Structure 1
């Protein structure tokens, strides 16, 4: 699921699954 183009909710969803209890930051402007 990670080794593809991931945009929008798809990207957010991959971050959620990979990062787990760490959580993550989603900075699309940065």
Structure 2
């Protein structure tokens, strides 16, 4: 429901407020 670009802390802070319970871990696919 937003239109902000997600990248470093932006894409991260997102997962943090997205999963929270299940948790999450940044991924780095080749």
Same fold by TM (over 0.5)?
A: yes
Structure 1 unaligned blocks of 5 or more: none
Higher RCO structure, 1 or 2 (CA under 8 Å, sep 6+): 1
List 4+ stretches of structure 1 deviating above 2 A: 1-5
Structure 2 unaligned blocks of 5 or more: none
What TM-score comes out, normalization by structure 2 length? 0.64
Q: Aligned-residue CA RMSD in angstroms?
A: 2.0
Higher strand share: 1
* Residue correspondences, number: 29
Higher helix share: 1
What TM-score comes out, normalization by structure 1 length? 0.64
